[PDB]
């Protein structure tokens, strides 16, 4: 019942890794300069391994049995199809890790003979063999964060476990359609990845308002992936099998479950046997759907066992938020402890113990929270925000190491109406773009399930369509939000908001001097930086539509 077994071999890197950066341009200020940012590397891999390696004690009950029955009934309402080899190859991202069999993403997408023939043999093998464990590679993820003294030492690198490219294409042929339909079918509104920022805000406000006396809480499972058992994974397969699927897919799904999802041998970058996994692999197609559904099942059963009154849940993988009817502060705490005890028995122990919350602004769901500000007519306007420490630390890093994929562009788009995106990120990046003279150059940013490409000059139209014109007129932010943003800049050692405000005026003027689309960006995105506001009318943005 151990999540992992290790041989002793180390988790090794592929290319040299840099954890501490040279110079920082964001936390830049004539007499004030700092660099309190870092990147996780292979060096902390052993520490992470220790943390995620433990025995899982799982014991189910009637509450769990009941919920699982309901979910399988809901799943039987779903029909899914196999993807063709061509479709599977086309869904393969352009730079996904190459195969050890002489081909890479490029060849998969161009349907080269070598790649196609290999994938076909892998598929045939899945239909013929439902037992032989499929090997996986384990690597330490390189992610950037800001040092946070008060909250303890630096984070250890997360561990990524994934199978060969050939197997990944096959997972899509067999389960991609299911991943796109199943979660919403069994969870409905509770499925978190179906909402745009404005939609998520609407869901939370509605949920909170429908309670006579609301009480909410976020549950943080300690290393969720490591807590899911072989039995949990086989149960996920039974849920998949409850759907209406072609026999060929059923065969492939069973094989993938027994040979890959339920666990298997892991090798490091050097090819050395590193260990055996008996929990969720982070790099397989079903990770998101599996975590989401399994978290939901355990959480719903735990709500019933704990006596949670009228729970409204929002699930994003291992991220869970429960809003219900308060039974009084003392009883709420008692019910939460009961919920936690139930979750623990289901093998979903808490990292940070949950606590009842009676202020919606303080409830974090899917890494975000709802806040409020005033619109142009003075009425309350709700929007989605989040602690800006990590996104700014990564924006500051991606400025000295402008990687192929940006995270700042994504944050600017998803959190466009926030004060930290408007005062800090937009000011900074439009300044960098003009300095580099690459304003019209298209860039690749990362939304969660799909990498996209966009031109910075298209931001105002994109933002209007995504958040409405209010995104350019929001004012009178809450003191909690102002305080949190100021704390982030302090932790990053970057100039404070009052200084960014001075800078935004200069950036705005520069954009307007360039005329054209750049001028539109200046007038719309920085109308907040001048006392005499501009009218700002609807833009021809009613010519776009996004997926994520
Ligand atoms: C993105 C954006 C930035 C500023 C404003 C704004 O109009 N103000 C504000 C200035 C602030 C400020 C200035 C310096 C340091 C910290 C905060 S906070 C604030 C507000 O309306 O909430 C006025 C009180 C002058 C509206 C939107």
From Swiss-Prot:
Superkingdom as given in the UniProt entry: Viruses
Bound cofactor: record note: Binds 2 magnesium ion that constitute a dinuclear catalytic metal center.
Binding residues for Mg(2+) 2: 220, 318-319
Localisation per UniProt entry: Host cytoplasm; Host endoplasmic reticulum membrane
Topology class, membrane: Single-pass type IV membrane protein
Reactions performed catalytically: RNA(n) + a ribonucleoside 5'-triphosphate = RNA(n+1) + diphosphate
Domain RdRp catalytic per the UniProt entry, residue ranges: 214-332
Cofactor field: Mg(2+)
PTM section of the record: The N-terminus is phosphorylated by host PRK2/PKN2.
Record text on activity regulation: Activity is up-regulated by PRK2/PKN2-mediated phosphorylation.
Role according to the record: RNA-dependent RNA polymerase that performs primer-template recognition and RNA synthesis during viral replication. Initiates RNA transcription/replication at a flavin adenine dinucleotide (FAD), resulting in a 5'- FAD cap on viral RNAs. In this way, recognition of viral 5' RNA by host pattern recognition receptors can be bypassed, thereby evading activation of antiviral pathways.
Subunit-structure text: Homooligomer. Interacts with non-structural protein 5A. Interacts with host VAPB. Interacts with host PRK2/PKN2. Interacts with host HNRNPA1 and SEPT6; these interactions facilitate viral replication. Part of the replication complex composed of NS2, NS3, NS4A, NS4B, NS5A and the RNA-directed RNA polymerase.
Protein name, as recorded: RNA-directed RNA polymerase
Protein's organism: Hepatitis C virus genotype 2a (isolate HC-J6) (HCV)
């Amino acid at each position: 019942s151990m999540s992992y077994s290790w041989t002793g071999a180390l988790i090794t890197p592929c290319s040299p890794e840099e954890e501490k950066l040279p110079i920082n341009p964001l936390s830049n200020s004539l007499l004030r300069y700092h660099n309190k940012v870092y990147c996780t590397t292979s060096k902390s891999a052993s520490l992470r391994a220790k943390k995620v390696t433990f025995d899982r004690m799982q014991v189910l009950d009637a509450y769990y049995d009941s919920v699982l029955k309901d979910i399988k009934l809901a799943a039987s309402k779903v029909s899914a199809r196999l993807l063709t080899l061509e479709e599977a190859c086309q869904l393969t991202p352009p730079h996904s890790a190459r195969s050890k069999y002489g081909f890479g993403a490029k060849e998969v997408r161009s349907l080269s003979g070598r790649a196609v023939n290999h994938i076909k043999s892998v598929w045939k093998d899945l239909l013929e063999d439902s037992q032989t464990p499929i090997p996986t590679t384990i690597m330490a993820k390189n992610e950037v964060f800001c040092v946070d003294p008060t909250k303890g030492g630096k984070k250890a690198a997360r561990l990524i476990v994934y199978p060969d490219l050939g197997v990944r294409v096959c997972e899509k042929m067999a389960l991609y359609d299911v991943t796109q339909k199943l979660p919403q079918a069994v969870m409905g509104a509770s499925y978190g990845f179906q909402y745009s920022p404005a939609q998520r805000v609407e869901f939370l406000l509605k949920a909170w308002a429908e309670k006579k006396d609301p009480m909410g809480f976020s549950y943080d499972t300690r290393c969720f992936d490591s807590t899911v058992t072989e039995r949990d994974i086989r149960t996920e397969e039974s849920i998949y099998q409850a759907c209406s699927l072609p026999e060929e897919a059923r065969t492939a799904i069973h094989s993938l479950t027994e040979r890959l999802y339920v666990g298997g041998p892991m090798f490091n970058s050097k090819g050395q046997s590193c260990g055996y996994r008996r929990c969720r692999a982070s790099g397989v197609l079903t990770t998101s759907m599996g975590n989401t559904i399994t978290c939901y099942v355990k959480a719903l059963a735990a709500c019933k066992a704990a006596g949670i009154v009228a729970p409204t849940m929002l699930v994003c993988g291992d991220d869970l938020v429960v809003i219900s009817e308060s039974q009084g502060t003392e009883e709420d705490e008692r019910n939460l402890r009961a919920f936690t005890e139930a979750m623990t028995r289901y093998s979903a122990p808490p990292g940070d113990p949950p606590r009842p919350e009676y202020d919606l602004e303080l409830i974090t769901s899917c890494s975000s929270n709802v806040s409020v500000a005033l619109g142009p007519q003075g009425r309350r306007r709700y929007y989605l925000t989040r602690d800006p420490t990590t996104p700014i630390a990564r924006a500051a890093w991606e400025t000295v190491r402008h990687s192929p994929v940006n995270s700042w562009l994504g944050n600017i788009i998803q959190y466009a109406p926030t004060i930290w995106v408007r005062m800090v990120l937009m000011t900074h990046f439009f300044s960098i773009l003009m300095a580099q003279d690459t304003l019209d150059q298209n860039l690749n940013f990362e939304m969660y399930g799909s990498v996209y490409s966009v031109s910075p000059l298209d931001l105002p139209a994109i933002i209007e369509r995504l958040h409405g014109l209010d995104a350019f007129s929001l004012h009178t932010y809450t003191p909690h939000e102002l305080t949190r943003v100021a704390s982030a800049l302090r932790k990053l050692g970057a100039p404070p908001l009052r200084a960014w405000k001075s800078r935004a005026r200069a950036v705005r003027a520069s954009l307007i001097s360039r005329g054209g689309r750049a001028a539109v960006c200046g007038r719309y995105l920085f109308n907040w930086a001048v006392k005499t506001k501009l009218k700002l009318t609807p833009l021809p943005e009613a010519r776009l539509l996004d997926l994520s």
